[PDB]
Amino acid sequence: KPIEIIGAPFSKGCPRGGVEKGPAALRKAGLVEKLKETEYNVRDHGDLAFVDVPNDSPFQIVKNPRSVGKANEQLAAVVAETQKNGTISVVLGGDHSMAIGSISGHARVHPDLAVIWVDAHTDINTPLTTSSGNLAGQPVAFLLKELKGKFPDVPGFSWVTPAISAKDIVYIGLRDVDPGEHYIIKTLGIKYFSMTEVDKLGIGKVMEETFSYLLGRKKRPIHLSFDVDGLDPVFTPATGTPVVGGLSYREGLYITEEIYKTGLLSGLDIMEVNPTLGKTPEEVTRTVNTAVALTLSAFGTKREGNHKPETDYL
Amino acid sequence: KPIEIIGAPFSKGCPRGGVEKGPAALRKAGLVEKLKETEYNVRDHGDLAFVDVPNDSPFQIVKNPRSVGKANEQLAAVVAETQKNGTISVVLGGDHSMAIGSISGHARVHPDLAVIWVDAHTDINTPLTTSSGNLAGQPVAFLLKELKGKFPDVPGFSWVTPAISAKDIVYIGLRDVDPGEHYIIKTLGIKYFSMTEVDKLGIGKVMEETFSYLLGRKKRPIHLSFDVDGLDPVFTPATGTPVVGGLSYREGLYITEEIYKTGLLSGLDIMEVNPTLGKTPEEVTRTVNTAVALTLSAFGTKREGNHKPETDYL
Amino acid sequence: KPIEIIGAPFSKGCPRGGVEKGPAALRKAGLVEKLKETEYNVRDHGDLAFVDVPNDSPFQIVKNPRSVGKANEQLAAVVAETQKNGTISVVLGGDHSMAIGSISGHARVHPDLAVIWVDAHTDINTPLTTSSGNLAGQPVAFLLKELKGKFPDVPGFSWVTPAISAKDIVYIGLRDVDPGEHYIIKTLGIKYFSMTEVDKLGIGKVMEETFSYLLGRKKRPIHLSFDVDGLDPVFTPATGTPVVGGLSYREGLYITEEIYKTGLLSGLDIMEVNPTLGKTPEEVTRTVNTAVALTLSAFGTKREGNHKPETDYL
Ligand SMILES: N[C@@H](CCCCC(O)O)C(=O)O
Ligand SMILES: N[C@@H](CCCCC(O)O)C(=O)O
Ligand SMILES: N[C@@H](CCCCC(O)O)C(=O)O
Ligand SMILES: [Mn+2]
Ligand SMILES: [Mn+2]
Ligand SMILES: [Mn+2]
Ligand SMILES: [Mn+2]
Ligand SMILES: [Mn+2]
Ligand SMILES: [Mn+2]
């Protein structure tokens, strides 16, 4: 199978500059080379150049609407393109608002896809419920069919078409949900495993249930959108919104290993790695290294080890 | 329901000064204000002023018997008072010996209560088995009916009446038990979940079983006495007796979330937070923040999020 | 029962000097004295003096073959000796290549023994598959019957006789396996629990299954070879090859407590503690303390506590 890396060095979805450096840090750490050592064919599409929209006045509270909307329209085109040729898209993030274009483009080719969202946050604030106008905390609002027309149209997002329904998404790692977002997920009946369900069930049973929930009836392509703050700050400190009590390095790897095993991974996002937020170089190294490890895991690297087929090592 | 915060800035139960500053550190962190944001009515009773008993000679090995006994008699009066008015008492600790007064006063109003003791220690040394005369390590000995008359009467504790039996207490987090204490809990048949049972069963099943054990027959008020050293030193380093290999931040929260869900929480103790034992300011901040988080969790704050009823956020 | 401590201050099995100081650091921490407090009879055999083989040229890639082979022949003699007298051998390590002599000598007296290998590594590289000539990463290759004649005879190891088969060993904690090693364990059908199986099953079920697999048919002596890097670097940082995402302090203790409970522990290795690799004195202290705790746990120390029989503490 073929893999195509797409860098999305974008940061206007939130106030902290730095996430745009995310793709560079991950490549610097050898992500592309290490992926070529796996059984997959890898092609690096490079980083997308995003045109800045001058005079991007805020829409009510929403900041940089046009710049975010345009960068995402462009990313959706690119992803739809690689998906069309039958390759697996891997988006290297800047902030999580880029999931709008990544999932939109992916859905144009695979309308029946399901989403596994690993994050400490639901990122489902609508333009009306946000306390901040930050779009990195609103991606899912723009993608849900059930949320269509529940918020005013935003400048730069008219090209977006709600592609997935509440039944096609599963959250894992939740521990920082605003009152409004909580209201939304409860009202829409969205399946989720907050840190309390992970604690109660154990990550092994959590994965069992998300698969029987999303793939029980029909086997369909999987889009894994992975926000690095889903893991505890001890493992991924270099992020914009760290929340204590998260997933461990082990649980994160367990999630990716199980997803690899389904044979259905179709799209992947590695978001919110911000190199400038590390208090010490080691903190940045720690964050980048685990992001790389999670990516390699999604493509076959197992902790029990790997050996090339047909090679008699004796 | 109503909540009444009662500060017990007391430290004579152990040799390390500093735990008396516990209540102040917790209030400083906004504990009271954060509690008012929950669905509960909060009333801060302030800190109790404890009269120091001059010439408090040790009783054999037991140190400061009269001062500890008197401070606890006074606390028991206060707690009995608030319990009588039907409010939930929350004692902010200095050392764990204050559980004597806290549980005694609580039992006067709710004689059928059950106790969930979260601690790395059993704190059940009798005045005869202690290696040190420290009373913070003997609370439970004074409260058990089955231990009545098994140790000489101590100066200052004649007002105490053993209120609970071995059948009404469950320990969680044990990992540092003296030979004598171990002998006692085995002989008396006290239910406990040491770190090895937590490791074996997972915190989810541990809570299931402590509830079926204490509430299986009759639903009764629950008193949760929480020693902050029950959690691993990595989360609560600012305590007098830290022991490695404890409960994680996540498991601690899981415990409080489950207790909140029973709807039976009646009394709560947040003990052993000693601000002067942090090696760095951050260590104190870390300890205070998790103590606050545990308290809020006992009163409804969920990791999956919270939203106010009747408020249509759309 | 009797315990005999045997120090193996050896480091030629790997490039990083320092592991030879392992035994001294462990004794310095009071290992021997603390063991005497248990129900066992303890005898310290002291440290073995290893004769250095001059002009030890490398065998192809393999470094210090003769020195490693000789030190192991000597250790095997000593262990066979103590095993013969019916005592439990406890080898305090330098590097893991010493498991060759420890297990070989043990098997001379107890041919039906089974091995529980706790390590982040399989240490099963053959002289032909190693990327480095380091012997600490090849112990198991020399011990497996199924690997006999699959690699050239090495200078200094002609005295070795493959004592155990693929059916008698179980790995726990794997997370860093070379392609060749992975090929070997898959081809030979060796039972293992990598960190992913520990994540999926939980340490409780992992122990259940390793016991039903190794002791289901016949109860036999157990040899526990414990590489300290099996635990996460946060608990045992002072080792030569730390790998993130390992067993926790709690899981490590759970393993030893369950092994103690079988009543079948016959041989124990505490390997790879390297005092010179701690970045701070506290890191070395942390590493030595958990190694001591694991050893005491193998011989009865429980987290729920211990009390001496026939002693009425009341
Ligand atoms: N719920 C917050 C936090 C958003 C952070 C989301 C992150 O995943 O991109 C907000 O809506 O502003
Ligand atoms: N078991 C020790 C430790 C007591 C520490 C108890 C703490 O929870 O207050 C002793 O009895 O002195
Ligand atoms: N697989 C590596 C790592 C060996 C480290 C083994 C350690 O347990 O002694 C190698 O074979 O060199
Ligand atoms: Mn997030
Ligand atoms: Mn996110
Ligand atoms: Mn304690
Ligand atoms: Mn206590
Ligand atoms: Mn190892
Ligand atoms: Mn090893």
CSV table of N, CA and C in Angstrom, one decimal, chain A residues 175-266:
chain,number,residue,atom,x,y,z
A,175,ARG,N,-11.1,14.7,28.7
A,175,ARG,CA,-10.9,15.1,30.1
A,175,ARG,C,-11.0,16.6,30.3
A,176,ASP,N,-11.3,17.4,29.2
A,176,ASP,CA,-11.4,18.8,29.2
A,176,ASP,C,-12.5,19.3,28.3
A,177,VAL,N,-13.8,19.1,28.7
A,177,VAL,CA,-14.9,19.5,27.9
A,177,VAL,C,-15.7,20.6,28.4
A,178,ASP,N,-15.9,21.7,27.6
A,178,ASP,CA,-16.7,22.8,28.0
A,178,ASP,C,-18.2,22.4,28.2
A,179,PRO,N,-18.9,23.2,29.0
A,179,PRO,CA,-20.3,22.9,29.2
A,179,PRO,C,-21.1,22.8,27.9
A,180,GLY,N,-20.9,23.7,27.0
A,180,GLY,CA,-21.6,23.6,25.7
A,180,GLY,C,-21.3,22.4,24.9
A,181,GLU,N,-20.1,22.0,24.8
A,181,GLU,CA,-19.7,20.8,24.1
A,181,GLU,C,-20.3,19.6,24.7
A,182,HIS,N,-20.2,19.6,26.0
A,182,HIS,CA,-20.8,18.4,26.8
A,182,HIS,C,-22.3,18.3,26.4
A,183,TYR,N,-23.0,19.5,26.4
A,183,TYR,CA,-24.4,19.5,26.1
A,183,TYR,C,-24.6,18.8,24.7
A,184,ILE,N,-23.8,19.2,23.7
A,184,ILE,CA,-23.8,18.7,22.4
A,184,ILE,C,-23.6,17.2,22.2
A,185,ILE,N,-22.5,16.7,22.8
A,185,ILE,CA,-22.3,15.3,22.7
A,185,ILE,C,-23.4,14.5,23.4
A,186,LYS,N,-23.9,15.0,24.5
A,186,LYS,CA,-25.0,14.2,25.2
A,186,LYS,C,-26.3,14.2,24.3
A,187,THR,N,-26.6,15.4,23.9
A,187,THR,CA,-27.8,15.6,23.0
A,187,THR,C,-27.8,14.8,21.7
A,188,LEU,N,-26.7,14.8,21.0
A,188,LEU,CA,-26.5,14.1,19.8
A,188,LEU,C,-26.2,12.6,19.9
A,189,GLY,N,-26.0,12.1,21.2
A,189,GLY,CA,-25.7,10.7,21.4
A,189,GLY,C,-24.4,10.2,20.8
A,190,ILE,N,-23.4,11.0,20.8
A,190,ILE,CA,-22.1,10.7,20.3
A,190,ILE,C,-21.3,9.7,21.2
A,191,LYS,N,-20.8,8.6,20.7
A,191,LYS,CA,-20.1,7.7,21.5
A,191,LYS,C,-18.7,8.2,21.9
A,192,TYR,N,-18.4,8.1,23.2
A,192,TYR,CA,-17.1,8.6,23.7
A,192,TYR,C,-16.6,7.7,24.8
A,193,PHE,N,-15.3,7.8,25.0
A,193,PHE,CA,-14.6,7.1,26.1
A,193,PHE,C,-13.7,8.2,26.8
A,194,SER,N,-14.2,8.8,27.8
A,194,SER,CA,-13.4,9.9,28.5
A,194,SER,C,-12.4,9.1,29.3
A,195,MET,N,-11.5,9.8,30.0
A,195,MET,CA,-10.6,9.1,30.8
A,195,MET,C,-11.2,8.2,31.9
A,196,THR,N,-12.5,8.6,32.3
A,196,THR,CA,-13.1,7.7,33.3
A,196,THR,C,-13.5,6.4,32.7
A,197,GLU,N,-13.9,6.3,31.5
A,197,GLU,CA,-14.3,5.0,30.9
A,197,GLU,C,-13.0,4.2,30.6
A,198,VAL,N,-11.9,4.9,30.3
A,198,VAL,CA,-10.6,4.2,30.0
A,198,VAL,C,-10.1,3.6,31.4
A,199,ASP,N,-10.3,4.4,32.4
A,199,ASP,CA,-9.9,3.9,33.8
A,199,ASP,C,-10.8,2.7,34.2
A,200,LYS,N,-12.1,2.8,33.9
A,200,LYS,CA,-13.0,1.7,34.3
A,200,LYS,C,-12.8,0.4,33.5
A,201,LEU,N,-12.7,0.6,32.2
A,201,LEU,CA,-12.6,-0.5,31.3
A,201,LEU,C,-11.2,-1.0,30.9
A,202,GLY,N,-10.2,-0.2,30.9
A,202,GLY,CA,-8.9,-0.6,30.5
A,202,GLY,C,-8.8,-0.3,29.0
A,203,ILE,N,-7.7,0.2,28.5
A,203,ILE,CA,-7.6,0.5,27.0
A,203,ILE,C,-8.0,-0.7,26.1
A,204,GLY,N,-7.7,-2.0,26.6
A,204,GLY,CA,-8.0,-3.1,25.7
A,204,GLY,C,-9.4,-3.2,25.4
A,205,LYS,N,-10.3,-3.1,26.4
A,205,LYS,CA,-11.7,-3.2,26.2
A,205,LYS,C,-12.3,-2.0,25.5
A,206,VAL,N,-11.7,-0.8,25.7
A,206,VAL,CA,-12.1,0.4,25.1
A,206,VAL,C,-12.0,0.2,23.6
A,207,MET,N,-10.9,-0.3,23.1
A,207,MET,CA,-10.7,-0.5,21.7
A,207,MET,C,-11.7,-1.5,21.1
A,208,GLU,N,-11.9,-2.6,21.9
A,208,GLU,CA,-12.9,-3.6,21.5
A,208,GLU,C,-14.2,-3.0,21.2
A,209,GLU,N,-14.6,-2.1,22.1
A,209,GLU,CA,-15.9,-1.5,22.0
A,209,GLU,C,-16.0,-0.5,20.9
A,210,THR,N,-15.0,0.3,20.7
A,210,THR,CA,-15.1,1.3,19.6
A,210,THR,C,-15.1,0.6,18.3
A,211,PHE,N,-14.5,-0.6,18.1
A,211,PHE,CA,-14.5,-1.3,16.9
A,211,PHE,C,-15.9,-1.9,16.7
A,212,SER,N,-16.5,-2.5,17.7
A,212,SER,CA,-17.8,-3.2,17.5
A,212,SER,C,-18.8,-2.1,17.3
A,213,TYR,N,-18.6,-0.9,17.8
A,213,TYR,CA,-19.5,0.2,17.6
A,213,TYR,C,-19.5,0.8,16.2
A,214,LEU,N,-18.2,1.0,15.7
A,214,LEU,CA,-18.0,1.6,14.3
A,214,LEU,C,-18.0,0.6,13.2
A,215,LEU,N,-17.5,-0.6,13.4
A,215,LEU,CA,-17.4,-1.6,12.4
A,215,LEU,C,-18.3,-2.9,12.5
A,216,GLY,N,-19.1,-2.9,13.6
A,216,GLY,CA,-20.0,-4.0,13.8
A,216,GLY,C,-20.8,-4.4,12.6
A,217,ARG,N,-21.4,-3.4,12.0
A,217,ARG,CA,-22.3,-3.7,10.9
A,217,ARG,C,-21.6,-3.7,9.5
A,218,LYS,N,-20.9,-2.7,9.2
A,218,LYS,CA,-20.1,-2.6,7.9
A,218,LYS,C,-18.7,-2.3,8.2
A,219,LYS,N,-17.8,-2.9,7.4
A,219,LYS,CA,-16.4,-2.6,7.5
A,219,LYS,C,-16.2,-1.4,6.6
A,220,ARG,N,-15.6,-0.3,7.1
A,220,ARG,CA,-15.4,0.9,6.3
A,220,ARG,C,-14.1,1.5,6.6
A,221,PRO,N,-13.6,2.4,5.8
A,221,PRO,CA,-12.3,3.1,6.0
A,221,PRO,C,-12.3,3.8,7.3
A,222,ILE,N,-11.2,3.8,8.0
A,222,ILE,CA,-11.0,4.5,9.2
A,222,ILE,C,-10.1,5.8,9.1
A,223,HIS,N,-10.6,6.9,9.7
A,223,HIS,CA,-9.8,8.1,9.7
A,223,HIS,C,-9.4,8.3,11.2
A,224,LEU,N,-8.1,8.3,11.5
A,224,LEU,CA,-7.7,8.5,12.8
A,224,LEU,C,-7.2,9.9,12.9
A,225,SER,N,-7.8,10.8,13.7
A,225,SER,CA,-7.3,12.1,13.9
A,225,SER,C,-6.7,12.1,15.3
A,226,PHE,N,-5.4,12.3,15.4
A,226,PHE,CA,-4.7,12.2,16.7
A,226,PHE,C,-4.2,13.5,17.2
A,227,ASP,N,-4.8,14.0,18.2
A,227,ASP,CA,-4.3,15.3,18.8
A,227,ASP,C,-3.3,14.8,19.9
A,228,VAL,N,-2.1,15.3,19.8
A,228,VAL,CA,-1.1,14.8,20.7
A,228,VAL,C,-1.4,15.1,22.2
A,229,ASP,N,-2.2,16.1,22.5
A,229,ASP,CA,-2.5,16.4,23.9
A,229,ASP,C,-3.5,15.3,24.5
A,230,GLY,N,-3.8,14.3,23.6
A,230,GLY,CA,-4.6,13.3,24.1
A,230,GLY,C,-3.8,12.5,25.2
A,231,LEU,N,-2.5,12.5,25.0
A,231,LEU,CA,-1.7,11.8,25.9
A,231,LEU,C,-1.3,12.7,27.0
A,232,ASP,N,-1.0,12.2,28.2
A,232,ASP,CA,-0.6,13.0,29.3
A,232,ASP,C,0.6,13.9,29.0
A,233,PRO,N,0.7,15.1,29.6
A,233,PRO,CA,1.7,16.1,29.4
A,233,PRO,C,3.1,15.6,29.7
A,234,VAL,N,3.2,14.5,30.4
A,234,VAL,CA,4.4,13.9,30.8
A,234,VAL,C,5.1,13.3,29.6
A,235,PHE,N,4.3,12.9,28.6
A,235,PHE,CA,4.8,12.3,27.4
A,235,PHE,C,4.8,13.2,26.2
A,236,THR,N,3.8,14.1,26.2
A,236,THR,CA,3.7,15.1,25.1
A,236,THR,C,3.5,16.5,25.6
A,237,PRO,N,4.5,17.0,26.4
A,237,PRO,CA,4.4,18.3,27.0
A,237,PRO,C,4.4,19.5,26.0
A,238,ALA,N,5.0,19.3,24.8
A,238,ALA,CA,5.1,20.4,23.8
A,238,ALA,C,3.8,20.6,23.0
A,239,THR,N,2.7,21.0,23.6
A,239,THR,CA,1.4,21.2,22.9
A,239,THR,C,0.8,22.5,23.5
A,240,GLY,N,-0.2,23.0,22.8
A,240,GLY,CA,-0.8,24.3,23.3
A,240,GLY,C,-1.8,24.2,24.4
A,241,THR,N,-2.5,23.0,24.6
A,241,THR,CA,-3.4,22.8,25.6
A,241,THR,C,-3.3,21.5,26.4
A,242,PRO,N,-2.2,21.4,27.2
A,242,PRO,CA,-2.0,20.2,27.9
A,242,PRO,C,-2.9,20.0,29.1
A,243,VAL,N,-3.4,18.8,29.4
A,243,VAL,CA,-4.4,18.6,30.5
A,243,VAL,C,-3.9,17.3,31.2
A,244,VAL,N,-3.7,17.5,32.5
A,244,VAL,CA,-3.2,16.3,33.3
A,244,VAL,C,-4.1,15.2,33.4
A,245,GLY,N,-3.6,14.0,33.7
A,245,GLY,CA,-4.4,12.8,33.8
A,245,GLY,C,-4.8,12.2,32.4
A,246,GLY,N,-3.9,12.2,31.4
A,246,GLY,CA,-4.2,11.7,30.1
A,246,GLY,C,-3.8,10.2,29.9
A,247,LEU,N,-3.8,9.9,28.6
A,247,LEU,CA,-3.5,8.5,28.1
A,247,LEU,C,-2.0,8.4,28.3
A,248,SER,N,-1.5,7.2,28.6
A,248,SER,CA,-0.1,7.0,28.8
A,248,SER,C,0.5,6.7,27.4
A,249,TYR,N,1.8,6.7,27.4
A,249,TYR,CA,2.6,6.4,26.1
A,249,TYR,C,2.1,5.0,25.7
A,250,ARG,N,2.0,4.1,26.7
A,250,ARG,CA,1.6,2.7,26.4
A,250,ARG,C,0.2,2.6,25.8
A,251,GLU,N,-0.7,3.3,26.3
A,251,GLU,CA,-2.1,3.3,25.8
A,251,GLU,C,-2.2,3.9,24.4
A,252,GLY,N,-1.4,4.9,24.2
A,252,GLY,CA,-1.4,5.5,22.9
A,252,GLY,C,-0.9,4.6,21.9
A,253,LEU,N,0.2,3.9,22.2
A,253,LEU,CA,0.7,2.9,21.3
A,253,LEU,C,-0.3,1.7,21.1
A,254,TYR,N,-1.0,1.4,22.2
A,254,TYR,CA,-1.9,0.3,22.1
A,254,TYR,C,-3.0,0.7,21.1
A,255,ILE,N,-3.5,1.9,21.1
A,255,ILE,CA,-4.5,2.4,20.2
A,255,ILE,C,-4.1,2.3,18.8
A,256,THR,N,-2.9,2.8,18.5
A,256,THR,CA,-2.4,2.7,17.1
A,256,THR,C,-2.1,1.3,16.6
A,257,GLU,N,-1.7,0.4,17.5
A,257,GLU,CA,-1.4,-1.0,17.1
A,257,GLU,C,-2.7,-1.7,16.7
A,258,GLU,N,-3.7,-1.5,17.5
A,258,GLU,CA,-5.0,-2.1,17.2
A,258,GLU,C,-5.6,-1.6,15.9
A,259,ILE,N,-5.5,-0.3,15.7
A,259,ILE,CA,-6.0,0.3,14.5
A,259,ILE,C,-5.2,-0.2,13.3
A,260,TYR,N,-3.9,-0.4,13.4
A,260,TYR,CA,-3.1,-1.0,12.3
A,260,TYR,C,-3.7,-2.4,12.0
A,261,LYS,N,-3.9,-3.2,13.1
A,261,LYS,CA,-4.5,-4.5,12.9
A,261,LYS,C,-5.8,-4.7,12.2
A,262,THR,N,-6.6,-3.7,12.2
A,262,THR,CA,-7.9,-3.7,11.5
A,262,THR,C,-7.7,-3.8,10.0
A,263,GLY,N,-6.6,-3.3,9.5
A,263,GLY,CA,-6.3,-3.3,8.1
A,263,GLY,C,-7.1,-2.2,7.4
A,264,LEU,N,-7.8,-1.4,8.1
A,264,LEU,CA,-8.7,-0.4,7.6
A,264,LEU,C,-8.3,1.1,7.7
A,265,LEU,N,-7.1,1.3,8.2
A,265,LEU,CA,-6.6,2.7,8.4
A,265,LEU,C,-6.6,3.3,7.0
A,266,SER,N,-7.2,4.5,6.8
A,266,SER,CA,-7.2,5.1,5.5
A,266,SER,C,-6.7,6.5,5.5
